[PDB]
Amino acid sequence: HHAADYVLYKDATKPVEDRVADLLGRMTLAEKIGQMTQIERLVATPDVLRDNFIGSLLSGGGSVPRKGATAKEWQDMVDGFQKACMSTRLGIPMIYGIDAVHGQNNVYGATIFPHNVGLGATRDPYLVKRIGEATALEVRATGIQYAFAPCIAVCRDPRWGRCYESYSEDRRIVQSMTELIPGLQGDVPKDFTSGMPFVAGKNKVAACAKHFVGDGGTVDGINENNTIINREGLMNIHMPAYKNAMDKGVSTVMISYSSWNGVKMHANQDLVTGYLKDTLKFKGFVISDWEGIDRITTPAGSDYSYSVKASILAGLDMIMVPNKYQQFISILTGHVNGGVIPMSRIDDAVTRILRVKFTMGLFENPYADPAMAEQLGKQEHRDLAREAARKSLVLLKNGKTSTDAPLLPLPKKAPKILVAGSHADNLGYQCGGWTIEAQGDTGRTTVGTTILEAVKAAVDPSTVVVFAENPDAEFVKSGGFSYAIVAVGEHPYTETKGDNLNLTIPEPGLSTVQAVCGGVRCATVLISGRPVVVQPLLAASDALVAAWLPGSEGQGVTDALFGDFGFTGRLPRTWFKSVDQLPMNVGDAHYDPLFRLGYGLTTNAT
Ligand SMILES: OC[C@H]1O[C@@H](S[C@H]2[C@H](O)[C@@H](O)[C@H](O[C@H]3[C@H](O)[C@@H](O)[C@H](S)O[C@@H]3CO)O[C@@H]2CO)[C@H](O)[C@@H](O)[C@@H]1O
Ligand SMILES: *[C@@H]1O[C@H](CO)[C@@H](O)[C@H](O)[C@H]1NC(C)=O
Numbered sequence: 371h372h373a374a375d376y377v378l379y380k381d382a383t384k385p386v387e388d389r390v391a392d393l394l395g396r397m398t399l400a401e402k403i404g405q406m407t408q409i410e411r412l413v414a415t416p417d418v419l420r421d422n423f424i425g426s427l428l429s430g431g432g433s434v435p436r437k438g439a440t441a442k443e444w445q446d447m448v449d450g451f452q453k454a455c456m457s458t459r460l461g462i463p464m465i466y467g468i469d470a471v472h473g474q475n476n477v478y479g480a481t482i483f484p485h486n487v488g489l490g491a492t493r494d495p496y497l498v499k500r501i502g503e504a505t506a507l508e509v510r511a512t513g514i515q516y517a518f519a520p521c522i523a524v525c526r527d528p529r530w531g532r533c534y535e536s537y538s539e540d541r542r543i544v545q546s547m548t549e550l551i552p553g554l555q556g557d558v559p560k561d562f563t564s565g566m567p568f569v570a571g572k573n574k575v576a577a578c579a580k581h582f583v584g585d586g587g588t589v590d591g592i593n594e595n596n597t598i599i600n601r602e603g604l605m606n607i608h609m610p611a612y613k614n615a616m617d618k619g620v621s622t623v624m625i626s627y628s629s630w631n632g633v634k635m636h637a638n639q640d641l642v643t644g645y646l647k648d649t650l651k652f653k654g655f656v657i658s659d660w661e662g663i664d665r666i667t668t669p670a671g672s673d674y675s676y677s678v679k680a681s682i683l684a685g686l687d688m689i690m691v692p693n694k695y696q697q698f699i700s701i702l703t704g705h706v707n708g709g710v711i712p713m714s715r716i717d718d719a720v721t722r723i724l725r726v727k728f729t730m731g732l733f734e735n736p737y738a739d740p741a742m743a744e745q746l747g748k749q750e751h752r753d754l755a756r757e758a759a760r761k762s763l764v765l766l767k768n769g770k771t772s773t774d775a776p777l778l779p780l781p782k783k784a785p786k787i788l789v790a791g792s793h794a795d796n797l798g799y800q801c802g803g804w805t806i807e808a809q810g811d812t813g814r815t816t817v818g819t820t821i822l823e824a825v826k827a828a829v830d831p832s833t834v835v836v837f838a839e840n841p842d843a844e845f846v847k848s849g850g851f852s853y854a855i856v857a858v859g860e861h862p863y864t865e866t867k868g869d870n871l872n873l874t875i876p877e878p879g880l881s882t883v884q885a886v887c888g889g890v891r892c893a894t895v896l897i898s899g900r901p902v903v904v905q906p907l908l909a910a911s912d913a914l915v916a917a918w919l920p921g922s923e924g925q926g927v928t929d930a931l932f933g934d935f936g937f938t939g940r941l942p943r944t945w946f947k948s949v950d951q952l953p954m955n956v957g958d959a960h961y962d963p964l965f966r967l968g969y970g971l972t973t974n975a976t
């Protein structure tokens with residue numbers, strides 16, 4: 371279709387499948403295996419990307435051009451890598467992935483949304499769609515085209531260090547929140563075939579339903595461990611949201627480090643190929659987790675030849691290596707050259723990778739758009755995050771007896787008020803994990819508004835606001851305070867550092883609440899990724915709010931505390947009386963919660 375040097379795969383007017391087939395039929399084995407290889411920016415150079423025909427790059431948690439980097443610094447980095455990939459013989463653009471799991475959260479100045487557990491408390495799938503939309507814009511602000519989200523784990527045990535990445539213990543709520551997908555990617559057309567990949571164009575991103583499957587079902591919530599449950603329970607609890615993701619055209623699926631009845635997911639041909647591909651008709655690409663193939667073996671990495679064979683035969687398409695690319699490529703080449711892995715398997719993996727790349731427009735818009743940089747941390751997006759934070763809050767108590775005047779909403783005009791606690795003025799704590807670093811951090815780690823700052827922004831000009839991080843009882847009794855707002859809770863974590871068998875918050879936390887509330891009526895704001903032991907905090911407090919990990923926009927908290935809006939959040943998880951009860955989920959035969967799933971007290975707006 372027209373100049374003498376025409377190449378069908380480069381013609382943007384042609385159908386995606388024809389483009390895929392045209393390009394695939396021109397590729398060498400080295401070109402093919404290159405597409406299946408995703409590497410860390412940390413090991414990427416222009417020559418490495420060209421010489422190994424690399425298909426994809428990622429930033430792992432905290433893998434950044436430098437701390438504090440601007441949106442344009444990110445665009446320039448990604449475009450430098452892209453220029454190298456475009457200079458190859460076939461000029462196949464790379465796709466760049468990142469964990470944009472509550473906003474574009476590795477990036478300084480990105481809006482940070484509530485984590486998933488709080489989003490589940492909103493029961494507002496349209497809010498979550500609008501978050502996916504805003505997140506796509508902030509990811510493309512940085513030149514990145516692919517987000518490793520949503521996590522659709524159904525966390526069945528809050529001792530898991532990733533429980534905050536799960537919208538709920540109830541699969542129906544997780545199903546509902548798959549609306550993130552068409553927010554990130556755009557809505558699928560009317561005619562759409564379930565399981566096809568979809569991204570609307572250069573202002574959207576490829577999404578990733580993760581981690582397939584049962585990552586939330588592991589024994590005692592041990593991260594990356596074994597999920598022991600019969601097929602009926604796997605299909606009833608852990609699988610359903612994957613079908614909703616197919617129906618909404620999720621572009622990619624990431625495999626879990628976990629096992630199902632002792633079989634590693636990264637080696638599970640029956641589930642990856644027999645179920646996802648052949649039964650759900652998934653036609654996008656299947657990506658490993660980080661060194662996921664290495665962890666097939668015990669110890670991890672002890673027979674990488676086997677890891678490559680087992681994973682590729684199971685049906686994985688793209689391997690997040692992410693560092694030892696030379697060894698990966700060499701081993702996979704040898705297996706194909708030996709007949710251990712048939713060309714048909716290679717050609718399927720590459721078909722799927724190319725299908726997502728062509729579908730999303732990456733061959734037409736391989737480079738960043740400098741006009742999108744100003745989307746990062748845009749006030750409209752912060753206003754959305756503030757709405758989300760406020761909707762996510764669950765009011766657990768609002769008065770010590772049935773006869774007390776309700777403490778919340780608090781008056782904005784008072785002579786003097788106290789704001790206290792370890793989490794009242796700590797932006798990193800209020801954001802939790804996957805913020806700037808994987809594990810999060812402490813203090814002013816990005817642009818935002820802490821609880822203290824939000825209080826000062828809300829109150830009448832006549833109200834004197836005193837901050838004391840950990841005041842003693844005398845200080846409170848002598849201070850002439852009308853009331854106190856005290857914020858405490860968990861430190862940031864992810865993955866296996868967050869696995870926690872006791873679920874008691876660090877001190878000083880309870881002791882500050884006791885000191886404060888003993889001297890003046892108090893509203894306790896608990897920041898956590900999950901339910902934690904709460905009776906002692908409840909006993910001390912007049913009012914108590916489960917604010918989860920609300921993100922950068924602390925004014926969401928004060929919007930409800932001062933009555934601009936009423937409390938509407940409902941628990942998306944069971945609140946246990948004791949950790950010896952766990953696991954314990956709604957619907958279990960022996961269900962004895964402190965607060966059941968769905969519990970939440972309400973207030974009306976002033
Ligand atoms: O990020 C791509 C996919 O990565 C994997 S593993 C991911 C871990 O969940 C996270 O805990 C880990 O954080 C470590 C940093 O990489 C280290 O540099 C520092 S020293 O310590 C932290 C935590 O120990 O990072 C890994 C790489 O990002 C996930 O399971 C996927 O959900 C994620 O998409
Ligand atoms: C589960 O963790 C235990 C205890 O750490 C470990 O020995 C075992 O290999 C893990 N199992 C799986 C399947 O990951």
Ligand SMILES: *[C@@H]1O[C@H](CO)[C@@H](O)[C@H](O)[C@H]1NC(C)=O
Binds near residue numbers: 867870871872873874
């Ligand atoms: C609870 O477990 C965490 C994480 O495993 C540990 O670091 C902490 O000290 C524990 N708390 C108590 C009271 O044992």
Ligand SMILES: *[C@@H]1O[C@H](CO)[C@@H](O)[C@H](O)[C@H]1NC(C)=O
Binds near residue numbers: 973974
């Ligand atoms: C809040 O509004 C509801 C619904 O109108 C009402 O029934 C309830 O009495 C109200 N509570 C307060 C404190 O105004």
